[PDB]
Structures are given as structure tokens and as C-alpha cells.
Design a binder for this molecule. Sequence first.
Ligand code: CLA
Ligand code: CLA
Ligand code: CLA
Ligand code: CLA
Ligand code: CLA
Ligand code: CLA
Lengths: 738, 150, 118, 144, 80, 39, 75, 61
Amino acid sequence: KVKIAVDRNPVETSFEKWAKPGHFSRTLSKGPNTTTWIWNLHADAHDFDSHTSDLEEISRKVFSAHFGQLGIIFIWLSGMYFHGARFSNYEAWLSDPTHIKPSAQVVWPIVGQEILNGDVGGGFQGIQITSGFFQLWRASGITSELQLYTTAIGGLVMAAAMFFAGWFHYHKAAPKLEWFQNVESMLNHHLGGLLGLGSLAWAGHQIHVSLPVNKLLDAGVDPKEIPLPHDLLLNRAIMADLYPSFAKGIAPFFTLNWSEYSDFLTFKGGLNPVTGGLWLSDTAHHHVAIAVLFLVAGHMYRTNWGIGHSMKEILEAHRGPFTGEGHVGLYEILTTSWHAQLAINLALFGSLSIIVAHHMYAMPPYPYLATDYGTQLSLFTHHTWIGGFCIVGAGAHAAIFMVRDYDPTNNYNNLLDRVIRHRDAIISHLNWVCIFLGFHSFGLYIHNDTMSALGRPQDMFSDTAIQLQPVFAQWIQNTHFLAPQLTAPNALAATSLTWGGDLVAVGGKVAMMPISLGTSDFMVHHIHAFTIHVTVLILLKGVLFARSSRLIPDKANLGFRFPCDGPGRGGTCQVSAWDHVFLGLFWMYNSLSIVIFHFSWKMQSDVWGTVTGVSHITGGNFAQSANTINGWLRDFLWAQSSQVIQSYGSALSAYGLIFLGAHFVWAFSLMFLFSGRGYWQELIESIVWAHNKLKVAPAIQPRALSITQGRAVGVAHYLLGGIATTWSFFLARIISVG
Amino acid sequence: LNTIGWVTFYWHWKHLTLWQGNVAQFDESSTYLMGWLRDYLWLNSSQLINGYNPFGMNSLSVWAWTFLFGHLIYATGFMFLISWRGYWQELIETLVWAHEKTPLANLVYWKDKPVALSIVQARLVGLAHFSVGYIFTYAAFLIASTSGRF
Amino acid sequence: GMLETPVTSAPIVATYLSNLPAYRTGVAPVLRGVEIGLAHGFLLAGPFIKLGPLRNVPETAEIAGSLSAAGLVLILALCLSIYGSAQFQPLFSADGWSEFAAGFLVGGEAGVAWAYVC
Amino acid sequence: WTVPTLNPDTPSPIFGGSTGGLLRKAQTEEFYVITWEAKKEQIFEMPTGGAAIMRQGPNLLKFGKKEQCLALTTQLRNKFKLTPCFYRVFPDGKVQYLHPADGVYPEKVNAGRVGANQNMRRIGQNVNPIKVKFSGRMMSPAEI
Amino acid sequence: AHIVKIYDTCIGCTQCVRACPLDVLEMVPWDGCKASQMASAPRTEDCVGCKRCETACPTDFLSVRVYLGSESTRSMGLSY
Amino acid sequence: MKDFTTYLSTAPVIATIWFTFTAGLLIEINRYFPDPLVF
Amino acid sequence: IIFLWTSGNLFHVAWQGNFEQWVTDPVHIRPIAHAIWDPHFGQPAVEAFTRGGASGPVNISTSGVYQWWYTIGMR
Amino acid sequence: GPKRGSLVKILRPESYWFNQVGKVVSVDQSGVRYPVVVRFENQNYAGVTTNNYALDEVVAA
Ligand code: CLA
Ligand code: CLA
Ligand code: CLA
Ligand code: CLA
Ligand code: CLA
Ligand code: CLA
């Protein structure tokens, strides 16, 4: 029986507990005695499992927390639309997209920072933005600043509604645990209503607003002269002027004569040649199909009527001879443990963000996006980073489940148990394959460096010496390019230019050309495979040995996050799963930095550039230079760092400042990573003496940071430094040569 | 290492600007760290990293290789510096399992039981790799820049 | 208990491991060494010839590859000898392992010489 | 209380077999054997990873190191209110009982235990390391 | 073997004994404190040196001390 | 309201208000007295 | 070890360097440290490290020993 | 020695609260070696605020 269940007025709305720091924890509510308390107060603020044992109260807390997050995001979107309406050059950009740089941030004229307002065109001065909002807004059919302003007000109103919803569903009407545990109903409603009705309503907006406005914009008529969207809904004669299908109305829909809707529901493929983006008619058909698919998918699970599947029954039905009880117990795990759910959802959400990065570079969905090289680099890089972070988080919360929620007396000879029971075999095989990948992938680079240094280029791994061609990827590429002729007859062109074919250019710049894969591409892909496998090794080892190992047989009783178990047994520093997340974070940084470097150099070398033949940004040096480390060091980092290092005295000077600042923060992290808190505690003792001598010793006792906090501060400043460094490099480079 | 790196960066750049002839370059660019990074480290490593390239090689290729060699040893030292013992001890225990269970390789057995490096030894090995890479990187840069430009 | 897998507990795997020459328990260590050397030197002669530094010079690629293979077989026999000198202070004895290492030297050089005589 | 004997013919808990069990140390040097008597059939957690069913009556597991037997003893003693004892077994067959070596668990005082390694002074009353230079080995001032 | 020592500031709170993961320490009769109990370390050959006892001891300064010494197969916590 | 003033008296809120006041004061001084190096 | 180090520096300069040629014009001639025998080289590397005036590949010393030995009276 | 609740000063040199002031809980009257129970308003690194002391380690100051 699926129904609404709610408790009335559980928690009174009062400012009392705001005035009592650490009220949520019985330990921290005693007050502060040393400085450690403060850090604890912020570290355990949102760890709701350590607050209460009651799953209902925890579930309510996470629900209202999620509402808070959504309100914050709505404030953020409201801000972006408002700054796009009031402090931007969006209309001028609409009138000339190929020669006006998108800018939506202006600085005030104080202390000389006014220089950051550069000549972006359109009679405007500001910082060129690379988020891609202008291309998104043109694709949505927005033409005036007024519509953006109204969207800003709407998003602010929605943020107020989200914070009211949070307060309401925590303090006034807070859902019960059996409401939260209706996962079959939740899947039905989210697959139908969210994804399904989302893409249906978006396809509605596209077909009714986007297609005509962008068809006129591609035709060339002045945006102010283009009819307003409500007129397009009101007078169907205009819709029939652009696409005659609309003359017949919704009669071909209900009579199943859908072929007459071919004017705006197409299957062209490729890119719009005058605009460099995917066809909005293809995107409209795509969202209609997606809508129908998800609405079909959302009627699968049984709720209040006999029809529908049962999650526990589908899980308990798939059992084989090799796995024993199979998927028995997993339903119970995934309907009582928030951390298991968070692990799964983070893994797929991160992976999905990486897929978003690749598919959005390869098949540019917004108009005048592919030739906004800065926007393309920024979007790819950004979503790749977000992805990687969410994957590391997935490993983290998997381990947190393994320590806090795992209970084998409901989980006995099961998939999870067998994984735990042959973890040594798993980790040893992963270990070997990581060493193998490392040796042969990195060893080719070291081999090439040595041969190149010794004056023997004929002994290198390259396209002219000993070739290592990516035959499989080339075959898949060729197949994908030849697909419209045989295996996808209704396709006018391939889904992406990178498979092969011609060349689409907009405003003299290359939007997309065919990407060729050679020995250097082989080598970087196996580097990627190596780094990903190592990251998986660390995280998976962390989750499999979170409970016990031959070294620490009772590791589970020590918790998820703990420094060690002492210098005995040879030394047990960093045995915790938290410390495995810490190392996985460093390795994730390594992997994704080489990934975004691959993308940057490959695009600037073999894809981007001006059309006269195509003159690429770096002349095509990738195929011969990307086989040695010296080649990456000289032709990529050193060569392309010119723009960032000589950005002083111009509008890009902030990128030089943040280059230096990021280098500094990265280095600053090394003190925390390389040192230990005993030294710092003793130093603080001497300083405390000095303060005592002058009667200024605080009542809250100065303590060195904990071992785990030293590691956390270390990795956070390390990531911030490195990532911000590559950020400044990338943005200064691509804005100056773009 | 930081302090001697500062004193020798300073010595070397003030003497390169004396030897080239434009001490005005040091007197102008020395007052800001972007002038340091741009006009000393970026500028004087132009012929170093061109010691070998896909067009050929010359006499500075040994110093380009040793420059990358020092960057590599430095970076390898960071592994012992950041990651600590019990991770590697668990990894080595799974390696011990794999070797003792692998057929036709468990006929070969160690005489000394393999264990992870101790904490103090780890600090010493990381500081050793860190220091050797520091020394080789700055030696290669200093010798190659001064000899290639004079 | 120990985990059960087809890989560790298959009868075809057990018969194959009992038929490989490191397991027969009643053949001589000299004979085990010469058979293992005739296998491993014959396989090791290949990649030195095909990928070595003299691989593109006619009539000398195979000579230099077999000569480097013989040098590596000599290094491996020295490794076997010092492993026996460290480990043991019929195959698992000092005299038996010295016999096995000498047999590996002879069989490996014979395998390299037969991989050339080709 | 008398020192009990190891029964090698004691039934083991129901367990499908992990990869984290014994190694060549059990064949060359030593392994340890833990023994308890349960009141009912109940699932516990193996210290080497995984789940296992203890039988109703005498149970018997064997581990590599000592801390594994202490971890299983602490689990069976604080979670199930059981009284296990684990022994030390050599490849000769020599069987060394311990824990509780007095028969009474070490977390409570028992008359008859001789105090060992007890310095009858404070830690601040130790000598300086100059006073213990040039003995036969490295010495700490707390050794004397 | 690691050197484990007990000092006369012990108040027989038994915290070190219930913290040791190896059964090295035990409580003996004594008269020096109100609890009439003292810790003792008769089995330091099995001590790994984790210092849980030192973490568990309440007295200031410590009444149990672990001096890391020469390593054996038991003190290194090896299962192989 | 007493509890809301105690929350405003808590340490990060007062650090925020005080640094906002100090930064705004320096910003105002650098606006009305542009680019001071001496005196 | 220190005196063997110094005797080795002297011997490798005396055999593989250009000291007697350096003292004629110590402004334009580079001080050779020791000769290179590396069978991993290629012919461009042999030509590149064969600088002058030497037969084969050499290293150019940066230790000041030619200046010190020439000042203290070696010819 | 000192009575209950009176303030003392610690002169055990390896104590955390050496050369500082605490408050007497009780003094045991047996043959216990460290009978003076002193509480301190600040905690040591172990988070303990109470320690036993001797008669010649406390001074009523
Ligand atoms: C505005 C009126 C209001 C008042 C007076 C209260 C009062 C209370 N809430 Mg409720 N609640 C409200 C609205 C309110 N709430 C809203 C709008 C939400 C949705 C987010 C909730 C959801 C909620 C949950 C889930 C919980 C409470 C709890 C509580 C109680 C203790 C919390 C506390 O003292 O910390 C005061 C907290 C703060 C002062 C911090 C505010 C955090 C916001 C979201 C920060 C966002 C800032 C943003 C990140 C910008 C940062 C930028 C950069 C510097 C990083 C207290 C009775 C807790 C409870 O009852 O435990 C028993 C509890 O678990 N509330
Ligand atoms: C078909 C109806 C429907 C829709 C559209 C949603 C949508 C959502 N739910 Mg779900 N939910 C539903 C039914 C639905 N739910 C049911 C029936 C249950 C009980 C089985 C749940 C139990 C549930 C839990 C426990 C949680 C969610 C959460 C979410 C949000 C995920 C965040 C996101 O990525 O969205 C993208 C964001 C948007 C699309 C913004 C628009 C959102 C507005 C409110 C429209 C959504 C419709 C909403 C259900 C109507 C509420 C009307 C209200 C006045 C009564 C998303 C807004 C999570 C959350 O974030 O909580 C805040 C969460 O923790 N839901
Ligand atoms: C999913 C979102 C969506 C929405 C909102 C719309 C909306 C519309 N489309 Mg459609 N369209 C869509 C998706 C969508 N479309 C898709 C996916 C396709 C591709 C197959 C199309 C293809 C298409 C074609 C070919 C045509 C339309 C047309 C229309 C318009 C009239 C349709 C109609 O008669 O509805 C039926 C009527 C209703 C649903 C009535 C609404 C209910 C009322 C408002 C209830 C009021 C009750 C209340 C008590 C009274 C008010 C009281 C108050 C004043 C106090 C309407 C604006 C027609 C048009 O006009 O083109 C410009 C048209 O020719 N569409
Ligand atoms: C240059 C920097 C550097 C290098 C080379 C390494 C190397 C390694 N790391 Mg480490 N790591 C680093 C930085 C580095 N790390 C840092 C900064 C941290 C702190 C966060 C870590 C933390 C870390 C973790 C958490 C893990 C690793 C692991 C590994 C090993 C991966 C296995 C492998 O690929 O074998 C292949 C060997 C190489 C790629 C090294 C280069 C070998 C060259 C090319 C050939 C060698 C032949 C040689 C020239 C012959 C010498 C002869 C001469 C002696 C006479 C590998 C040895 C992982 C591991 O061991 O699991 C398998 C692992 O889990 N590291
Ligand atoms: C780490 C990866 C790696 C790889 C794949 C290579 C590969 C190569 N190197 Mg390079 N090298 C490397 C790292 C690597 N190197 C590093 C790190 C350095 C710096 C120290 C060098 C420095 C260097 C020099 C100076 C030279 C080379 C040369 C070569 C070439 C000849 C090598 C040779 O003849 O060996 C002999 C071949 C073997 C020993 C094969 C052993 C490995 C076998 C094939 C594994 C098979 C396992 C099998 C699949 C398992 C089956 C099990 C089943 C039967 C049960 C070859 C292309 C030479 C050259 O000129 O190339 C053109 C050369 O002169 N390398
Ligand atoms: C620890 C490592 C180290 C290394 C590798 C070097 C290396 C070098 N030093 Mg440096 N030096 C060092 C530390 C080091 N130094 C330290 C710690 C000091 C301070 C004491 C110096 C002070 C120093 C000076 C002042 C000079 C050098 C010079 C040199 C260079 C020439 C080689 C040499 O010393 O000839 C080997 C030297 C000897 C074998 C000994 C020389 C003769 C001694 C002083 C007296 C002999 C007395 C005689 C036996 C008595 C006979 C009595 C009679 C009655 C029979 C070489 C680069 C020289 C240079 O820069 O030239 C360009 C130079 O002038 N060094």
C-alpha cells in the first residue's frame, strides 16, 4: 500500500539552537575546550548518521537538505540570468555572433582592476565568459534582455519556494520512513514525471518556440524584427508559413499519419552548416522520442494496483550456479542505507558527466558553440572534473556503507559476500594489470625519450618508425562513418563529423573536422587506461579492505575515518578507507589532468583553426610530438604558456595572477602533506608560552590539526592549486589564440 | 633546499643579466615574481628543452634528458612523502598471497619476508629522491642555460 | 577453508600441471633444466631478432639477436645459481639446484642455437 | 581450573572459503587455533573477511596471526557473550594454550599472577641516556 | 621484542588491558593504589607496539610505556 | 530575538560583519583617495 | 677516497682532455672533462658530442680544474 | 595534606599542568603512593582533566 505518510509539527521553528553551536552532537554540545572542537563542529555538521540512529529522522534531514541545495542552485541560475540581462552584451552578440565575444561580468573602477573590462565588442567592456550561457539562450529562442530578467525573477521565486519547501517538510509536515521507503513508486514517478514529462515539455517548448525563432535567426532577419514567441503559439498561420505541417494541426498525430511531421521532426544528422550546431529539428524529434521512452519506462513497478513489477522479486529471481544466492539481500541494503544509494548514484552521475563532456564536444548541440573554442574547452574540462570528483565520492560512500551499514547476518552467501571473500584475488589481479599497463604505456614514452635523446629516431614508437596503429578504433570510426548508407538508412549524414567526411566551418573557423587516430592517440589512450585502472585499484581496495585485512583484523571497529593503529606491526599509517579516498583523489587529479591535456592539445593541433586549407592553432604537431615527455613539456606546456605568462598589462592579467596564486596554493599544500602534527603541536607549545608571558593565552587551547585533518587540508589545497593552475593556463591560452 | 634555491636563482639571474649586458632587465623584472617566472625560468629554458626534438638533437640533449630525469625523481619522491605505510603493507600482503598461490612460481620462494618500508625509512627515501631530483633539475638548467647562451 | 574456483581445482589443469617438467617428481634435475632451457631459450631468441637495434641490417639481425639471447640465458643461469646458493644452505637441494642451473644453461644455449639454425 | 587440551576433531563453522586464510607461515612456522562452544546457531563475521555460521556446540577455526584470534575473541565475547580460548600450534604438533592463560580473563585481577615489567618509580625518575652509553647493545634508560 | 614497562602511577583502571589487541597485559594484586590493582606485561614477545594501551591510559604522564625495539615475526604482525 | 542576537554574536558572523566593515572602509578610502603611496 | 678522486680527475684530464691545447688560447677553447664511450649512442649523437678539438665524443668540464691547474703552474 | 576544594600548584615536572593551578578533590588516607586527586579546568592532550599527585608534588598556592 503506497500512500502519503507525514508527522505533524515534529520540530519547532526556533532560533534557540542557532545560539548553541554543536547542539546536534552529544559530544560537541558540551562546548569548546581546545580548538579541535571548531573543526569537529564543521566536519560532522552534515553527518546525520552520527547524530541519530533513527533512519526516519536521518531521511527527513537529508530531504530538507536537498531542498536547501535546490534553492541555492536556483539562486545561482537566477544570478546568471540577471547578470546576462543587466550586465552583458547578449543582444549585440545576437546581432553578430561571429565577431563579438560573450561577456556577462563587469568590474567596478577601483584600485586599477578596471583593466579587466576588455574590448569584447558590441560597444561593451567586460570579462569574456566561457560558461556557454549565450549559446544556450540563443538555442532556447531568447532574444531580449527582458526575457532573461523575467527568467531571473522566476528563478528567485522558485528559490524562495524551495527554501519554504525545506522548512515545511522538516518543521511542519515531515514525511514518514515508509513514505521514503516507497522506492518502486519513487522510480515510477521519477522516470515518468521527471525525465519523461521533462523532455516532453521541453520538446513542446522547442517545437513551439525554439525552431521558428532559430529558423528566422539562421535566415538572417533582425532579432527585434522576429515575431515574439506568444504570437507563434497564437497564430498557427505563421507556423504553417515556416513549416506547412502545422497547417494540418494535431490531426496527423491522432490519426497516426506521423510522416507529415517531417518538417520539424527530422533525422538529418551532422551540423547546421550556417550555424555549426546540431539541427534543432533533430533535437526536437530526439526529445519527443526520449519523452515517450521514459513515460513507457515509468509504468514498470507495482504500486497500488496488481500490475507492475517488484524490485525484490526481479532481484531474487536472478540466481545462478556460480554465484549462489545471487542478488538476495540487495533490496534490503538499498532501501535502508543512504550511503549505498549515494555510492551508486555518485558513480553513475560522475560517469554521466564525463559522457556529457565527450558527447558535447563531439556533437555540438548549441549554435555558434563549436567555434567558441574557449567555451568548448571550458565545458569539456569542467564536466570532466565534476565527473571525476563524483566517482571518487562514489568510492568514499561505498566504503562508508561497508563500515557502518554492512551487516552479514542479513547478508550471508551473497554477491557482496563472495566479493569480500575473494578480495585478495581481485586486488592482486588489479595490482598486476596496473603494473603491466604502467610499464608498457609509460615505458613507451621513456623509450622514445631515450631514443630521441640518443640520436636514433628510427627506433622510436611513432607513425614513421615502429608504428602502433589503433586499428580497432579506426575500424569503429570507419564503421560509424559508413553507417548512414547501410545500417541507418534514414540518416542523411553521420551523427558526428569526427567519424570522417567533409568539413563544417562558420565565420572562417573550423567547427568540426574528422579526427584521425594514430600512434600518439594509441599511447595516450593506454595512459588513460593505466591511470583509471590505478584509481579504481585504490578506491576498490579501500572499499574491499575497509572492514578487515591481514594487517588490521578488526579495522571495522576503528571506524571509516581514523589516522592509523599506531607505529607497531611495522607501521599502520593510512590504513583507513578514508585514506584510500585521499590517495584516490590524488590519482584522480593525475588521470583527469592528462585527459584534459590530451583534449586541449589534440583539438588545437588536429581540429580547430582558421579556414583560408585549414591552418591549425598549433600546426598539427601532435602526431609527431606527443610521443615523448619532452614533446609534451616543450610543445604543450612551455609553448602554450606564453599567453598566460605575458598576459600582464591587459584584460587577461587576472589569469596570470591566478596562475601564480594557484602555483602558490599547490606548493602550500606540500607542507601539510609532507609534515606531521607532532612538530606543529610542539611549535604551538612554544608560541603558547610566548602568549602566556604576555597574558594573551586564549581559553580555547591552541591545538595542532589532527592527522586526518592535515591530510584533508593537504589534498584540498593540492587539488585547488593544480586544478586552478590548469584553469588559468587553459583560459588565457584559448582566449588569446581563439 | 628552498633557501639555497632562492640564493642560487638570485645569483644566477643577476649574473646572467650582468653577462648578457642588460642589468636593467634584472633591475626591472626582479621586483615581481611574475617577472621571475617569465624572464628567468621560462626564458632561459628555451635551448635546454630543444636539446632533442623531432627535428634532431644537439649537445644539450644530455642536459634536457637530465632535466626531465630530475623532474621524475622529484616526483617519485613525492610518492614516499605523501603516501604512508599501511596502504603498501596491505598491498604487499595481497602480493604475498598471489605469489604463494600461483602455480609454477610458488616453487620459488623468498628468503626474506617482504614487508612495506618503515615510517622513518619512508621519510628518508622520499627526502632522498626529492633532493636528488632537485639537485639534478637545477644543475641541468643552470649548466645548459649558461653554456648554451655563452 | 580455501575458495573453490575452476581455475585452481580443475582436473585438466591438474593433469597439465602434473605433465609440465617442473612437477614430475622422479626425473633428474639435469633433465628438468635442459627441457626448461630448450623451451625458454627458443622462445627468447625471437624478440631480440625482430626488435633489437640491428633489426634492419640484413644477415646480422638474427646473429645479434641470438647472441643477446645467449647472453640473457647466461645471466639467467647465474641468477639460478645464486638463488640456489641463497635458498639451500631432489630439485630442492643444493646439489640438485646446481644440477638444474647447469642443465638450464646447457638447454638454453642449445635452444638459442636451434632457434638460429633456422 | 586446569589447562585444556586441543581437540583437532572439532567441527568448524559453516564457511565457503576465503582467499584471506592461511599461508606458508602455517606450514613452516606456526598457526593459531581458536575454540569456543556456542548456545545456538548464529551468523558471525570472520576476521579475514566474509560471513560464517557457527554451529550449535563446539566450534573450531584456525588463523595465521594472534590479532585475528583476539579480534574474533572480542567479537564473540562482546556480541554473543561467549567464552573462547585459542591456542598456538606448531608444524611439529606442539600445542601451546593461552588466553585465558590463568583461566580467568586478563581484564580482572586474579590472585597468583606475578607482576612482570613493573618499574617501581615514575617515568620522570628515569636516568639520562648518558648513563646507559656503551653497554652491549642499544638500551633505553627505562630498561634499567 | 618491544619493551613494555608499567610505572607506579597506575590506578588499576584496566583500560590498557581492555585496549590491547594481543593479550599482552594483565592485572595483578598490588597495594600502591586504591583499586589494589596494577598492570603488568608478562607477554611482551607478542606485542606489536600499536600503543592502544598508551592511548587508553588516563594518567598524566603515562603509566604504561611502549619502547619499539627489535622486530620479530610476531611483533611485525605478519600472517606470512 | 534574544537567541537570534546570540547567534549574531557567535564568532563567524561577527568575523563576517567586522571584515565587511573593515574591507568596505578600506575600499571607500581607496575610492575617495585614489592610489595613495606616501604620507 | 678523496686522493683517489683527485688522481682520477687528473688522469682523465691528462688522457682525454685538451689541456695543452687549452693553455694556448683559454678564451675560445672549451675544457674537456672525459671521453664518452656509450654503445647506446647513434651517429648523430656521436657527431654532436664530438665537439672539438677531439677525436670522439667528449664532455665539456664545468669544474674549474683547468683554470686552477693552469694558475698553479701546470702546462 | 590539603583539604577538599582548596587550590594547589603542581610541581611534578612531567605533568601537563606543571607550574599551574588545580583544585583538590580528595586526599586518600591509605598507604597509596599518589593520594591527592586534583582537577584542572583545562584538559591535557588526552582530554583528561583529573590526575593523582603526591604530597611533595602539590603546594597549597
Ligand atoms: C528560517 C527559519 C528557520 C529556523 C529558525 C529553523 C530552526 C532550526 N532548524 Mg530548520 N529548516 C529551515 C528553516 C528554519 N529552521 C529551512 C529553510 C530548512 C531547509 C534547509 C530547514 C531544514 C532543517 C534541517 C534538515 C534541520 C533543521 C534543524 C533546525 C534546528 C537547529 C538548527 C540550527 O540551530 O542550525 C542553524 C543553521 C545555520 C545557522 C546554518 C544555515 C545553513 C544554510 C543552508 C547555509 C547555506 C549557505 C550557503 C552554503 C552559502 C555559503 C557560501 C560560502 C561561505 C561557503 C532549529 C530549531 C535541525 C534540527 O532540528 O536538528 C534536531 C535539522 O537537522 N532545519
Ligand atoms: C512525478 C512526480 C515527481 C517529480 C517531478 C519529482 C522530482 C524530484 N524529486 Mg521526487 N518523489 C516523488 C515524486 C516526484 N519527484 C514521489 C511520489 C516520492 C515518494 C516515493 C518522491 C520522493 C523523493 C525523495 C526522498 C527525494 C525526491 C527528490 C526529487 C528531486 C530530485 C532533484 C532533481 O534532480 O530534479 C531537478 C529539479 C527540478 C525539476 C526542480 C523542479 C521541482 C518542482 C518542485 C517540480 C517537481 C514536482 C513535485 C513532486 C511537486 C510538488 C508539489 C508540492 C507543492 C506538493 C526532483 C525535483 C529529491 C530531492 O531533491 O528533494 C528535494 C529527494 O531527496 N523525491
Ligand atoms: C508537452 C508540451 C506541449 C504543450 C504545452 C503544447 C501546446 C500546444 N500545442 Mg503542441 N506539440 C507538442 C507539445 C506541446 N504542445 C509536441 C511534442 C508536438 C509534436 C507532435 C506538438 C505539435 C503541435 C502541432 C502540429 C500543433 C500544436 C499546437 C499546440 C497548441 C494548442 C494545442 C491544443 O489544442 O491543446 C488542447 C487543448 C487543451 C489542452 C486545453 C488546455 C486546458 C485549459 C487551459 C484548462 C482551463 C481550465 C480552467 C478551469 C479554465 C480557466 C479559468 C480561469 C480563466 C479563471 C498548444 C499551445 C497547435 C498550435 O496551435 O500550433 C501553434 C498545433 O497546430 N502542437
Ligand atoms: C613520477 C612520479 C611517480 C611515479 C613514477 C610513481 C610510480 C608508481 N606509483 Mg606512485 N604516487 C605518486 C607519484 C609517482 N608514482 C605520488 C606523488 C603519490 C602520492 C599521492 C603516489 C601514490 C601512489 C598510490 C596510492 C599508488 C601508487 C602506485 C605506483 C606504481 C604503479 C604501478 C606501475 O605502474 O608500475 C610500472 C612502473 C612505472 C610506471 C615506473 C616507471 C618505470 C620505468 C618506465 C621503467 C623501469 C625500468 C628501469 C629504467 C630500469 C632501471 C635499471 C637501473 C636500476 C640500473 C608505480 C611504481 C600504485 C601501486 O603501486 O599499485 C600497483 C598505487 O596504488 N602511487
Ligand atoms: C616499458 C615498456 C617498454 C617496451 C615495450 C620497450 C620496447 C623496446 N625497447 Mg625500450 N626502453 C624502455 C621501456 C620499453 N621498451 C625504458 C623504460 C627505457 C629506458 C631504460 C628503454 C630504453 C631502451 C634502449 C636503449 C633500447 C630499447 C629498445 C626497445 C626495443 C627492443 C627491446 C628488446 O629487444 O627486448 C627484448 C625482448 C624481450 C626481452 C621480450 C620480453 C617480454 C615478453 C615479450 C613478454 C611476453 C609475455 C607473454 C605474453 C606471456 C605469455 C604467458 C603464457 C605463455 C603462459 C623494443 C621496441 C631497443 C631498440 O633499439 O628498439 C628499437 C634499444 O636499443 N629500449
Ligand atoms: C664535500 C664535497 C665537495 C666536493 C666534491 C668539492 C669539489 C671541489 N672543490 Mg670544494 N670545498 C668543499 C667541499 C667540496 N668541494 C668544502 C666543504 C670546502 C671548505 C673547506 C671547500 C673549499 C674549496 C676551495 C677553497 C676550493 C675548492 C675547489 C673544488 C673543486 C676542485 C677539486 C678539488 O677540490 O681538488 C682536490 C684537493 C685536494 C686533493 C687537496 C688540495 C691540497 C691541500 C689543500 C693541501 C695539501 C698539503 C700537502 C699535502 C702538505 C705537504 C707538506 C710538506 C711539508 C710535505 C671541486 C669542484 C677549488 C676550486 O673551486 O677550483 C676551481 C678551490 O679553490 N673547494
